[PDB]
């Protein structure tokens, strides 16, 4: 359930011997393995794979339950280089829609009437 066996290979080999003596839509699934996950180091490599999703559907395949938001901010840098030279980018147009919708709800999660942050006397004003 954790990743500890796949990290340390030498520990996992010794314990198994102990017991016994005693392609269109094919491309869509391969890119889910590095995006609907916790976090990876594939970021410059992770950003290029999202590009040739068929571009009629980005929000259906980016705005989901848990998409990596560290695959959303380097997604913005690569679709600019297309625009700085040439044709308009399916990388950079549909990922301006995803960035600004998650920004609003956290402020919707914020309370109504804002009071100024005070690190010297934080709880002395109110139960805000």
């Amino acid at each position: 359930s954790s990743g500890l066996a796949q990290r340390h290979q030498r520990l996992y080999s010794l314990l198994d011997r102990f017991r016994l003596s005693t392609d269109k839509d094919w491309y869509v699934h391969l890119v889910k393995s590095q995006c609907w996950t916790r976090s990876d180091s594939a970021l410059l490599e992770g950003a290029e794979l999202v590009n040739r999703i068929p571009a009629e559907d980005m929000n259906a395949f980016m705005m989901n339950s848990e998409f990596n938001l560290s695959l959303l901010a380097p997604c913005l840098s690569l679709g600019m280089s297309e625009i700085s030279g040439g044709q308009k980018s399916a990388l950079f147009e549909a990922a301006r829609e995803v960035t600004l919708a998650r920004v609003s709800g956290t402020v919707q999660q914020l309370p109504a009437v804002h009071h100024v942050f005070q690190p010297e006397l934080p709880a002395e004003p109110a139960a805000y």
């Binding site: 976090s39 990876d40 180091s41 970021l43 560290s70």
Partner: protein
């Protein structure tokens, strides 16, 4: 001279001036004193540069070859530097994030600048 080129962003010319400080103390210090604190600053900051820029084996000198076998100076800070050369060779995004939280009081803010630019160029 090493505090200039990291303001001037000369990270490759910064490896030339750190291997010249360490080649005199093995000729003059072996360390004494005044020369014992010049060698603490130069084996904590040649390790944060070879992960920042990871040199090829042609331009990796026989002096750079010796210090990276030892890892893959205070006992508090000697233990957290062997652990950071491992993660960037394993590309471990969870390993590198909890060490800057736990190496921020240990370094000074000249050595705190070289650890910031590794965690970005591996993430």
């Amino acid at each position: 001279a090493a505090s200039c080129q990291l303001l001037a962003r000369d990270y490759t010319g910064a490896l030339a001036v750190f291997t010249r400080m360490q080649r005199l103390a093995r000729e003059h210090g072996s360390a004494l004193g005044a020369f014992s604190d010049v060698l603490v600053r130069c084996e904590v900051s040649r390790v944060l540069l070879l992960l920042l820029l990871q040199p090829p084996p042609a331009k990796l000198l026989p002096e750079h070859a010796q210090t990276l076998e030892k890892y893959s100076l205070p006992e508090e800070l000697f233990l957290l530097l062997q652990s950071l050369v491992m993660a960037t060779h394993e590309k471990d995004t969870e390993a590198i994030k909890s060490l800057q939280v736990e190496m921020w009081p240990l370094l000074t803010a000249e050595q705190n600048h070289l650890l910031h630019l590794v965690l970005q160029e591996t993430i």
